[PDB]
Design a protein around this motif. Structure first.
Motif, short mmCIF file in Angstrom:
data_model
loop_
_atom_site.label_atom_id
_atom_site.label_comp_id
_atom_site.label_asym_id
_atom_site.label_seq_id
_atom_site.Cartn_x
_atom_site.Cartn_y
_atom_site.Cartn_z
N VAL A 19 0.83 -1.20 0.00
CA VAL A 19 0.00 0.00 0.00
C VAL A 19 0.87 1.25 0.00
O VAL A 19 0.63 2.19 -0.77
N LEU A 20 1.92 1.26 0.83
CA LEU A 20 2.76 2.44 0.95
C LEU A 20 3.43 2.80 -0.37
O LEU A 20 3.53 3.98 -0.72
N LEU A 21 3.89 1.80 -1.12
CA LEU A 21 4.59 2.07 -2.37
C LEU A 21 3.65 2.24 -3.56
O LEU A 21 4.03 2.91 -4.53
N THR A 23 0.27 3.39 -3.38
CA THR A 23 -0.66 4.51 -3.26
C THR A 23 -0.18 5.77 -3.98
O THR A 23 -1.00 6.40 -4.67
N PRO A 24 1.08 6.20 -3.87
CA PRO A 24 1.51 7.36 -4.67
C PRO A 24 1.37 7.13 -6.16
O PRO A 24 0.96 8.05 -6.89
N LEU A 25 1.69 5.93 -6.65
CA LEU A 25 1.54 5.65 -8.07
C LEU A 25 0.07 5.68 -8.49
O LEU A 25 -0.26 6.19 -9.56
N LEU A 27 -2.34 7.41 -7.03
CA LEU A 27 -2.84 8.77 -6.90
C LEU A 27 -2.11 9.77 -7.79
O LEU A 27 -2.50 10.94 -7.81
N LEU A 28 -1.07 9.34 -8.49
CA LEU A 28 -0.36 10.23 -9.41
C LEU A 28 -1.25 10.93 -10.43
O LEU A 28 -1.03 12.13 -10.67
N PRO A 29 -2.23 10.29 -11.07
CA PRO A 29 -3.06 11.01 -12.04
C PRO A 29 -3.84 12.18 -11.45
O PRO A 29 -4.28 13.05 -12.21
N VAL A 30 -4.03 12.22 -10.13
CA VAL A 30 -4.72 13.35 -9.51
C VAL A 30 -3.96 14.65 -9.76
O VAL A 30 -4.55 15.71 -9.99
N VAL A 31 -2.62 14.58 -9.71
CA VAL A 31 -1.81 15.79 -9.88
C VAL A 31 -2.01 16.38 -11.27
O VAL A 31 -2.14 17.59 -11.43
N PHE A 32 -2.02 15.52 -12.29
CA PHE A 32 -2.20 16.01 -13.66
C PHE A 32 -3.65 16.39 -13.93
O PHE A 32 -3.91 17.28 -14.75
N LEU A 42 -4.47 17.90 -3.10
CA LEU A 42 -5.39 16.77 -3.09
C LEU A 42 -4.63 15.45 -3.07
O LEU A 42 -5.05 14.50 -2.42
N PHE A 43 -3.50 15.38 -3.79
CA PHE A 43 -2.67 14.18 -3.75
C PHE A 43 -2.18 13.91 -2.33
O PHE A 43 -2.25 12.77 -1.85
N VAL A 44 -1.70 14.95 -1.65
CA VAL A 44 -1.22 14.78 -0.28
C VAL A 44 -2.35 14.33 0.63
O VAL A 44 -2.18 13.42 1.45
N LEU A 46 -5.22 12.79 -0.12
CA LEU A 46 -5.66 11.43 -0.42
C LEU A 46 -4.63 10.40 0.04
O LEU A 46 -5.00 9.33 0.54
N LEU A 47 -3.34 10.70 -0.14
CA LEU A 47 -2.30 9.80 0.35
C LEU A 47 -2.38 9.64 1.86
O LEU A 47 -2.28 8.52 2.38
N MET A 48 -2.58 10.75 2.57
CA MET A 48 -2.71 10.68 4.03
C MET A 48 -3.95 9.89 4.43
O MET A 48 -3.91 9.10 5.38
N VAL A 50 -5.45 7.44 2.71
CA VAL A 50 -5.23 6.02 2.47
C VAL A 50 -4.29 5.44 3.52
O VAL A 50 -4.53 4.35 4.05
N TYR A 51 -3.21 6.16 3.83
CA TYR A 51 -2.27 5.68 4.84
C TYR A 51 -2.92 5.56 6.21
O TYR A 51 -2.58 4.66 6.98
N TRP A 52 -3.86 6.46 6.53
CA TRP A 52 -4.57 6.37 7.79
C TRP A 52 -5.54 5.20 7.81
O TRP A 52 -5.64 4.48 8.81
N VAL A 68 6.58 17.19 5.39
CA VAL A 68 7.41 16.82 4.26
C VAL A 68 6.81 17.31 2.96
O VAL A 68 7.45 18.05 2.20
N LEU A 69 5.56 16.94 2.69
CA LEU A 69 5.00 17.07 1.35
C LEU A 69 4.67 18.51 0.99
O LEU A 69 4.95 18.94 -0.14
N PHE A 70 4.06 19.27 1.90
CA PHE A 70 3.67 20.64 1.57
C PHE A 70 4.85 21.50 1.14
O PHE A 70 4.70 22.26 0.16
N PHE A 72 7.90 20.47 -0.22
CA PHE A 72 8.44 19.98 -1.49
C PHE A 72 7.52 20.32 -2.66
O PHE A 72 8.00 20.70 -3.74
N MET A 73 6.22 20.19 -2.47
CA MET A 73 5.25 20.47 -3.52
C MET A 73 4.86 21.94 -3.59
O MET A 73 4.00 22.30 -4.40
N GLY A 74 5.46 22.79 -2.76
CA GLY A 74 5.22 24.22 -2.85
C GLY A 74 3.89 24.68 -2.31
O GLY A 74 3.51 25.83 -2.53
C1 LIG Z 1 6.59 7.29 1.18
C2 LIG Z 1 5.46 8.25 1.48
C3 LIG Z 1 5.57 9.57 0.76
C4 LIG Z 1 5.58 9.47 -0.74
C5 LIG Z 1 5.61 10.81 -1.44
C6 LIG Z 1 5.53 10.73 -2.95
C7 LIG Z 1 5.40 12.07 -3.63
C8 LIG Z 1 5.17 11.98 -5.12
C9 LIG Z 1 4.79 13.30 -5.76
C10 LIG Z 1 4.32 13.17 -7.19
C11 LIG Z 1 3.67 14.41 -7.75
C12 LIG Z 1 4.61 15.54 -8.04
C13 LIG Z 1 5.58 15.26 -9.16
C14 LIG Z 1 6.45 16.44 -9.52
#
Ligand SMILES: CCCCCCCCCCCCCC
Ligand SMILES: CCCCCCCCCCCCCCCCCC(=O)OC[C@H](COP(=O)(O)OCCN)OC(=O)CCCCCCCCCCCCCCCCC
Ligand SMILES: CCCCCCCCCCCCCCCCCC(=O)OC[C@H](COP(=O)(O)OCCN)OC(=O)CCCCCCCCCCCCCCCCC
Ligand SMILES: CCCCCCCCCCCCCCCCCC(=O)OC[C@H](COP(=O)(O)OCCN)OC(=O)CCCCCCCCCCCCCCCCC
Ligand SMILES: CCCCCCCCCCCCCCCCCC(=O)OC[C@H](COP(=O)(O)OCCN)OC(=O)CCCCCCCCCCCCCCCCC
Ligand SMILES: CC(C)CCC[C@@H](C)[C@H]1CC[C@H]2[C@@H]3CC=C4C[C@@H](O)CC[C@]4(C)[C@H]3CC[C@]12C
Ligand SMILES: CC(C)CCC[C@@H](C)[C@H]1CC[C@H]2[C@@H]3CC=C4C[C@@H](O)CC[C@]4(C)[C@H]3CC[C@]12C
Ligand SMILES: CC(C)CCC[C@@H](C)[C@H]1CC[C@H]2[C@@H]3CC=C4C[C@@H](O)CC[C@]4(C)[C@H]3CC[C@]12C
Ligand SMILES: CC(C)CCC[C@@H](C)[C@H]1CC[C@H]2[C@@H]3CC=C4C[C@@H](O)CC[C@]4(C)[C@H]3CC[C@]12C
Ligand SMILES: CC(C)CCC[C@@H](C)[C@H]1CC[C@H]2[C@@H]3CC=C4C[C@@H](O)CC[C@]4(C)[C@H]3CC[C@]12C
Ligand SMILES: CC(C)CCC[C@@H](C)[C@H]1CC[C@H]2[C@@H]3CC=C4C[C@@H](O)CC[C@]4(C)[C@H]3CC[C@]12C
Ligand SMILES: CC(C)CCC[C@@H](C)[C@H]1CC[C@H]2[C@@H]3CC=C4C[C@@H](O)CC[C@]4(C)[C@H]3CC[C@]12C
Ligand SMILES: CC(C)CCC[C@@H](C)[C@H]1CC[C@H]2[C@@H]3CC=C4C[C@@H](O)CC[C@]4(C)[C@H]3CC[C@]12C
Ligand SMILES: CCCCCCCCCCCCCC
Ligand SMILES: CCCCCCCCCCCCCC
Ligand SMILES: CCCCCCCCCCCCCC
Ligand SMILES: CCCCCCCCCCCCCC
Ligand SMILES: CCCCCCCCCCCCCC
Ligand code: NA
Ligand code: NA
Ligand code: NA
Ligand code: NA
Lengths: 513, 513
Positions: A19-21, A23-25, A27-32, A42-44, A46-48, A50-52, A68-70, A72-74
């Protein structure tokens, strides 16, 4: 045939990492699909979620994902995400947890429980009612898990004493066993909703209100209590009637009376520390209630408006626990020069509090607050409100009923706090779409996320009850179905009858526009 | 005669409550002396300082005083005081603590310690040097208390093996015992200053910098390391020489070698979990160092400026510990359908981290940050700067020397974190009065508050060493006097030679005007 089951157990063994590896794959289409900032938020989220729901990570560890995510993703910088984890709501939570630790340290909760059990009686309907009242009252101030874990051994001892023929008698006994073992976690979940500090989702509601609606201040300890306590009592009585009818058939009594009195005697004489902790608890509750009940002028009016809060009151009260002596002071000690000069034991040391405060739940509340802040700042709330356009024609009462049903169904499989964290921004935006008071939708969701009755995984008290081994999944399911129905109906009644007067839900607030 | 001692022990027995109740009365004239807002802020700060120095309350409980006092006195509302307790500096602290918990969970610290002890040698000067190097290196990432408590039993075992005639030999042995037992806490305090996460006062410096100088961003993990590590090495070497001269006289060797090798063998074979934790620690340190070292372009330039921080890096690294397996994965397990399907143990569970993270220190850092925020917002900093007018003629180097001496003297009786919390706003305002870089005064104070060498109460490692029972107060005092002198001199040298290049201290920064 066996190969399919083999592959099934292989996948289930590594479900955490899978699930951990994946779920990001997934949920990736959500970003596009969405605009970049809203899509990443929304990706962050939904990932949270699912992980919960899968506990692919520890809940508190998943709650640290925004940090972490906020950045890096700006979506939000570090210096904005990290302070959301200690908003004053979470310090009110910490003060409540410290007070509960002080109460449990001196066995005041056990004394109150056994006293209530003696007063209520011993008849099976009366004894079920006493167990439920005790657990619900103790869950308003202690955690539901702790209340259930403390009440279950007492119920087991009383049941052993009571039962210390053939099919009729044995099935009657078994149904009584099940009724007692199921009434405790249900009543704990019931009582946790009555106070703001009773359960974490209420404080999630406060923090996410602070994020989404900064000018909203009508929900506090006193207003939440006056709203939820009558609802708690009505639903507790309905659950007691339902459980007694389902299971209780709505010298043994002497033996149970003797066991309860014996355990109360085993508690020992009332100590000065217990009295001091009880006085401090009464001060805590009264000052929280009377600070600003919104319909009597409270003592907060004597100070600077917009400065005091329930957190300040709680922290100020619990600070006394860390220096108030646990042994009764005597003026004769000063004059008696031959008396020993040992240092006095305070009511609560910091080591005991630290080892008893659930910092995981505090971090979970912080993660929820940070996720709400990121959802607001990224513009994801605006996007959700835009997408919620098909539901603008739903009547507000029907909307309350539907969201309550959905949230009560969802909380049967995920933790209450995670459920309310995920669903609360949607509820606020749906309130914006219907031009109704945001609380009119947000409060029912917060209450209904605690309507976890059907499965052991629904809430930790259910797991504790199931650990006894004599409760079946089907019994819990068929009790919790009607428990959920009655809870939804009573929540709708409360939200449409007296929540309107308490929270002024009749008119659309200006700060919500 | 006996009556005076009787009254003395009576007062000392109740010193906690006496100080707690009489400090507000003693500090009451401060409120009337100063303007109201500044006076109340100074009252709160002085009360917190006295409570910290006397431990009239637990340090973390005293750190919660701002949440109570600032709103009642109108200095700062609840929704502003409470978020200061989780600024990103404290999340960097939490990530460092979690990483230290992971390191200590798998005994990686013990393996590194015993390896360094084997490589350094066994000769008394070399063995003192090895002990000090090991303790200083381990204190850069673990707490000084934990490093001292882990290194002391190894030193005791080695000393027992070495010594397993008459006056000369016995006094030589005794001086060796004292030298070993005093070199460990000194080196722990030395090494704690080399990294930002090594000791809490460095993170206090970061948070109070964020409060007083929001636009200051030149101090981070990499810059602090490149400044403090050479200073740490110089002062460690000076302390080693001083301790060897004072105590070390600057088959037994075989027995000590055998004991060290035997304990390393008792560690057992290197595990996959230990290797993974070491790899994650290396990634943690390298990514913290190379994120933005201020003189090589770091990987933070690849992202949004002003969004990433050391806290994000630390949290992201330590999140891996909570899902990375502790047993080595094998692809053969998927194909082997007869293999057991037990769930894998992760490197660190959240329960172990929660029971090993010192939440008291995290709350203490939060209280320091909140006090700095209140001091800035109340205008108390402006008032202190106005009152600091007699010291505007002091040369900056002499000012550094004097503040370092004062802080090193003060930290001998109070905790390092409380000392730096109390003195840092004064240092910043004194830097404003001299038209020098604020760091030029604030960094020496942060380093010198860790110059706690003379008393067991100065720092917990000193107490741990004194608990061995064979260290005298006079021995510690006479070693720590020269330790303090050498530390002050080396700090002045570092701050006037290479801190100027690292932190650009030559010119007065624009954000400080
Ligand atoms: C291991 C738990 C955290 C995983 C984070 C994955 C982040 C992926 C971001 C993809 C969308 C932005 C691409 C530029
Ligand atoms: C154990 C395994 C199972 C675990 C279950 C628990 C975890 C998940 C819990 C939540 C439920 C699933 C996720 C939420 C629903 C789907 C969200 C989604 O994908 O939203 C985007 C989606 C596509 O939108 P798009 O077509 O790009 O819009 C074009 C016009 N603007 O949008 C639409 O299609 C439009 C309607 C959007 C409605 C709101 C969507 C977000 C709801 C959650 C917010 C938080
Ligand atoms: C804020 C003002 C101060 C606080 C409120 C006023 C004082 C309350 C009592 C002081 C403390 C009492 C001792 C501490 C434990 C709590 C009471 C308890 O349950 O003790 C049991 C005892 C009755 O049983 P007992 O007599 O001990 O049995 C053995 C001997 N036959 O109990 C007793 O004898 C005392 C029963 C007290 C009942 C209190 C009822 C509620 C009062 C208002 C609470 C408001 C806030 C609620 C939240
Ligand atoms: C175990 C028992 C012992 C415990 C020791 C540890 C706790 C205390 C540690 C700090 C040292 C003592 C307290 C600090 C010094 C005194 C502070 C004080 O009283 O400041 C106000 C004082 C009077 O100022 P005033 O005369 O009203 O000014 C008129 C013109 N504006 O101001 C003056 O006289 C003018 C000079 C002010 C200099 C700065 C004062 C504040 C320093 C600390 C800031 C934090
Ligand atoms: C970021 C890139 C990845 C990390 C760096 C590169 C890989 C490092 C090594 C991988 C992990 C090694 C095992 C984990 C424990 C740490 C090493 C250690 O002290 O183990 C002892 C061992 C030497 O003794 P051993 O052979 O075990 O003795 C018994 C058998 N005769 O030790 C060894 O055999 C290995 C010695 C490794 C020495 C590493 C020196 C530092 C490398 C750069 C660190 C940068 C960050 C510093 C902070
Ligand atoms: C993680 C598990 C448990 C839940 C399911 C998550 C994944 C598979 C789901 C959740 C929401 C889904 C998206 C919802 C809407 C759209 C819009 C359109 O472009 C079709 C695909 C796309 C982009 C979907 C792709 C798959 C998706 C990302
Ligand atoms: C301290 C508590 C636990 C016990 C003492 C009695 C309680 C009921 C007292 C103590 C302080 C009191 C408050 C003090 C001041 C005010 C402001 C006034 O405009 C309305 C009444 C109100 C709001 C009082 C209500 C009653 C009160 C809360
Ligand atoms: C308010 C000011 C003027 C006076 C304060 C007096 C305080 C500090 C005194 C009064 C009575 C004292 C207590 C009397 C008896 C004992 C038992 C003995 O084991 C010492 C601790 C302890 C528990 C004392 C602690 C200190 C105490 C609480
Ligand atoms: C639990 C039992 C006792 C009752 C539960 C039934 C629920 C669904 C009933 C009880 C009271 C009802 C409300 C009473 C009055 C109104 C005002 C009207 O303008 C719209 C419908 C509305 C808002 C009703 C909606 C449905 C309602 C909430
Ligand atoms: C708490 C203990 C350990 C430390 C001493 C604190 C008290 C006694 C001290 C600290 C600073 C002092 C104040 C410093 C300056 C002034 C200005 C002038 O008006 C004289 C009195 C007054 C107002 C002092 C009163 C006493 C005072 C408040
Ligand atoms: C990941 C670590 C622990 C091990 C891998 C090697 C390290 C040294 C690598 C990994 C990522 C690398 C960085 C990636 C990108 C940049 C930006 C560029 O403009 C300057 C070099 C710099 C800043 C690199 C420095 C070296 C670096 C930090
Ligand atoms: C990356 C994707 C495609 C594949 C991921 C495979 C992961 C989930 C697999 C590969 C190897 C596996 C490990 C192999 C062996 C064992 C020992 C046994 O006691 C079960 C757990 C454990 C430790 C497995 C855990 C799951 C594991 C790590
Ligand atoms: C620890 C040992 C080796 C040296 C300690 C002595 C200290 C006090 C010495 C060493 C280097 C010295 C500095 C070297 C150069 C300058 C620049 C000059 O424009 C003002 C004095 C100043 C800033 C000196 C101040 C005193 C100083 C910091
Ligand atoms: C457009 C600016 C941001 C580009 C990258 C967004 C995704 C970053 C993911 C980082 C994941 C780190 C996990 C430790
Ligand atoms: C007969 C009643 C005796 C009561 C003894 C215990 C009193 C505790 C008082 C606690 C007060 C806390 C706030 C100052
Ligand atoms: C018991 C520890 C906290 C004590 C707080 C005392 C506050 C006194 C404030 C006095 C100055 C303001 C008067 C209006
Ligand atoms: C001028 C406005 C504020 C007036 C009161 C200031 C002092 C308040 C002290 C409250 C102490 C509470 C301790 C629990
Ligand atoms: C011969 C060397 C074997 C090494 C085995 C352990 C490897 C641990 C790797 C951890 C990587 C963590 C970040 C993904
Ligand atoms: Na509860
Ligand atoms: Na649930
Ligand atoms: Na350290
Ligand atoms: Na100190």
């Amino acid at each position: 045939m066996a190969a399919l089951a083999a592959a099934a157990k292989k996948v289930w063994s590594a479900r955490r990492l899978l699930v951990l590896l994946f779920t990001p794959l997934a949920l990736l289409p959500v970003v596009f699909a969405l605009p970049p900032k809203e899509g990443r938020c929304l990706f962050v989220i939904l990932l949270m979620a699912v992980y919960w729901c899968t506990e692919a990570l520890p809940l508190s560890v998943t709650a640290l994902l925004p940090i972490v995510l906020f950045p890096f993703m700006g979506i939000l910088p570090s210096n904005k995400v990290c302070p959301q984890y200690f908003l004053d709501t979470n310090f009110l939570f910490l003060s409540g947890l410290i007070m509960a630790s002080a109460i449990e340290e001196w066995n005041l909760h056990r004394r109150i429980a056994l006293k209530i059990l003696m007063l209520v009686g011993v008849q099976p309907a009366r004894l079920i009612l006493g167990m439920m009242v005790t657990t619900s009252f103790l869950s308003m101030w202690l955690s539901n898990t702790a209340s259930t874990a403390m009440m279950l051994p007492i119920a087991n001892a009383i049941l052993k004493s009571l039962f210390g023929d053939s099919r009729k008698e044995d099935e009657y006994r078994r149904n009584i066993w099940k009724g007692f073992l199921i009434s405790i976690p249900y009543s704990a979940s019931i009582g946790g909703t009555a106070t703001l500090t009773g359960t974490a989702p209420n404080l999630i509601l406060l923090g996410q209100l602070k994020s989404f609606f900064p000018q909203c201040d009508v929900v506090n300890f006193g207003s939440w209590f006056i709203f939820a306590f009558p609802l708690m009592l009505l639903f507790l009585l309905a659950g007691w009637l339902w459980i007694s009818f389902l299971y209780g058939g709505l010298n043994a009594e002497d033996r149970a009376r003797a066991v309860i009195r014996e355990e109360y005697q085993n508690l020992g004489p009332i100590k000065f520390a217990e009295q001091a902790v009880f006085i401090l608890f009464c001060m805590f509750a009264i000052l929280l209630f009377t600070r600003d009940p919104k319909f009597i002028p409270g003592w907060a009016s004597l100070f600077n408006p917009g400065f005091l809060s329930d957190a300040v009151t709680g922290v100020a009260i619990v600070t006394i626990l860390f220096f108030f002596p646990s042994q009764r002071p005597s003026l004769k000690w000063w004059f008696d020069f031959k008396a020993p000069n040992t240092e006095t034991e305070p009511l609560l040391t910091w080591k005991k509090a630290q080892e008893t405060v659930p910092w995981n739940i505090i971090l979970l509340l912080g993660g929820g607050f940070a996720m709400a802040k990121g959802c607001e700042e990224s513009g994801l709330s605006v996007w959700i409100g835009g997408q919620l356009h098909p539901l603008e024609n739903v009547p507000p009462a029907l909307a309350v009923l539907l969201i309550t049903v959905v949230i009560a169904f969802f909380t049967e499989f995920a933790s209450n706090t995670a459920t309310i964290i995920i669903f609360l921004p949607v509820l606020a935006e749906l309130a914006i779409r219907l031009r109704v008071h945001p609380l009119y939708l947000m409060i029912p969701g917060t209450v209904g996320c605690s309507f976890a009755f059907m499965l052991p995984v629904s809430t930790p008290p259910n797991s504790i009850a199931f650990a006894s081994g004599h409760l079946l999944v089907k019994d819990m399911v068929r009790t919790g179905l009607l428990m959920n129905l009655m809870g939804v109906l009573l929540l709708s009644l409360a939200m449409n009858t007296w929540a309107q007067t308490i929270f002024q839900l009749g008119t659309f607030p200006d700060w919500a526009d």
